[PDB]
Amino acid sequence: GSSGSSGHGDGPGNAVQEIMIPASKAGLVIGKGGETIKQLQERAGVKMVMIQDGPQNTGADKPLRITGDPYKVQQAKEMVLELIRDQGSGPSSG
């Protein structure tokens, strides 16, 4: 018949997403050196790498680079953003 089955040719690849993180909370999600953020990589299955590139003449922030997968990297991004995020009513007393 037609014998025209096309659709193939996707080598190796990795998804990456960058987000703005408040240096203030950065020390809470990263930890002393990066022990916390290290565990977050497994929770989402993606790699977390905080970028600095000497942030000069720019708003005080820390662009975090999350590499891994397109369907995963998207999940983690939320896990981190929610880490630095804050709400009105807090669960803890202190």
CA neighbor of 15 nearest in space, from 74, 81, 80? 74
**Domain at 14-85: CATH architecture:** 2-Layer Sandwich (3.30)
d(CA 17, CA 68): 9
- How far does Cα 76 stand from its chain's mean position? 5
CB within 8 Å of 19: residues ≥ 6 apart: 63, 64, 66, 77, 80, 81
Q: What is the experimental method?
A: NMR
Question: CA angle 17-61-90, nearest 5°?
Answer: 90
d(CA 11, CA 23): 36
